[PDB]
Write a protein that binds this ligand. Sequence first.
Ligand SMILES: *c1c(C)c(C)cc2c1nc1c(=O)[nH]c(=O)nc-1n2C[C@H](O)[C@H](O)[C@H](O)COP(=O)(O)OP(=O)(O)OC[C@H]1O[C@@H](n2cnc3c(N)ncnc32)[C@H](O)[C@@H]1O
Ligand SMILES: CC(=O)N[C@@H]1[C@@H](O)[C@H](O)[C@@H](CO)O[C@H]1O
Ligand SMILES: [Cl-]
Ligand code: NA
Ligand code: NA
Length: 502
Amino acid sequence: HENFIQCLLSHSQPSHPISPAIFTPQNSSFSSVLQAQIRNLRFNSTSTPKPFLIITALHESHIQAAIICARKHGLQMKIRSGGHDYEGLSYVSHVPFFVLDMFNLHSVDVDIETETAWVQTGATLGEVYYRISEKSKTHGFPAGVCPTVGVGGHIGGGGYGNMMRKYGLTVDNIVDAKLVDVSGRLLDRKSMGEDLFWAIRGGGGASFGVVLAYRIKLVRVPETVTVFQVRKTLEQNATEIVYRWQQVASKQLPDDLFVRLILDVVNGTKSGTKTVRASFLSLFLGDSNRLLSIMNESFPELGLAQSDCIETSWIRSVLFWTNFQIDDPLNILLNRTPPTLTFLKRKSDYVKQPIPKNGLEFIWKRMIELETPQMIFNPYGGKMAEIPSTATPFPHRAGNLWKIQYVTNWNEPGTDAANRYLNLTRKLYGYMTPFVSKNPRQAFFNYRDIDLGINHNGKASFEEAKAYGIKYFLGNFNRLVKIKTKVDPGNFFRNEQSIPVL
Ligand SMILES: *c1c(C)c(C)cc2c1nc1c(=O)[nH]c(=O)nc-1n2C[C@H](O)[C@H](O)[C@H](O)COP(=O)(O)OP(=O)(O)OC[C@H]1O[C@@H](n2cnc3c(N)ncnc32)[C@H](O)[C@@H]1O
Ligand SMILES: CC(=O)N[C@@H]1[C@@H](O)[C@H](O)[C@@H](CO)O[C@H]1O
Ligand SMILES: [Cl-]
Ligand code: NA
Ligand code: NA
């Protein structure tokens, strides 16, 4: 790989030297640089394939170099921003590969006048939120809950958060972007064209190029927002409460109200026994009095009271939504490292019809017998129902009541232990089949699941890619494929779930 390392130095601009950005295993730095952006401990095992090199891009020129050199030397590049990829596809590969690490490109330039912000893809959601909140307590951006998530993957993959019912996705709130293409041209919306600007807003940036920055459209948040978390076990009538949630959370609750439902298995009231806990976690873009009127009318079964409501800034709602204390200092959002790392599996599903009470009691018995899997239900409807399926590569719009995330975490290392938790996760997904979308079984790209299929990027690539691509992108998969064939016909930008060429 020394002709590649030489091509990189060969392409170095003298204003921004590439050498301090190149790490090979002979640098004693290498291990911690690889490890710094790892967010799934499954992909930090000794047996996990390591890149032979990491470029920690310090300038647009380092990206241009890495693309041009990797391309003429036929090398697999993995782009990494926040490293949250649930499958580690940003830092893991079964062919020899290097990682282009974007974390040093984390500029956030907030313009409250135009309600916009130029955000480098190496920035985290927490840095973006922190930087908005420093200029204005009445602006925000409808992205994800996890402060350490990277902008690159989050927006690339169609990121959502607790204001999607009001403002839609992250990708519904982009005015411009900067991207380096297969040719090493630095492009913006204008030079990139509407096809590529569409593709990188939910179609997985890493199939099309290195996104350097999104220009994001900020949104108005109220001077006061309301949050709550209310927990109900099966013994507190959780079945009736969940059942009612299903009928209102996407369909009836005003667009200002997001009520997430987290389902997990906890110790019951009788010793040794387990029960299902239904946690209702909410952001209301408004005050407790309007919320309490909504909930008394549309969802009284939750028993939401004034004592459940916390009123705070939009920025402190973010803290609350990531289990940080509501009085924590805001700069905790600048920590790029989560307080806990675990072994984890994620899958997703979409629900299009409410689960009958019989079906919920079914799920409670299955969840109690598998103990560890949890499910998170994220209501869609409001703006998510108003945007056409074609507006972004992300297709899941009207007709979807909610998105399920299957959440299985564990601490025990080793494949044997992994296989057990993966198996539990696959079983709950299996049980959920009749309740969730079918023909095809919809999936959310950002909840990446290699169980949906692996693109080996040879002869079979288009065939293999259909297996996850139709699930992620439904009928938009064909447009992604057309655009991929035009912007990257040689499939330089590839990964285990990349958009294939025709
Ligand atoms: C909470 C937590 C704790 C995690 C780890 C993930 C979360 C999350 N909460 C989320 C939420 O509330 N809403 C969401 O929509 N998603 C949430 N996620 C998932 C998260 O959005 C995805 O995992 C996302 O992909 C993370 O992005 P990242 O941190 O940038 O992750 P990677 O560096 O692993 O990259 C992911 C993926 O995108 C490609 N990529 C990264 N950077 C790129 C640039 N600059 N250009 C092009 N492509 C880029 C990577 O190659 C990889 O394929
Ligand atoms: C983030 C993390 O847990 N990384 C571990 C590191 O702590 C451990 O010491 C190292 C062996 O030296 O192996 C890594 O996977
Ligand atoms: Cl997560
Ligand atoms: Na290593
Ligand atoms: Na109402």
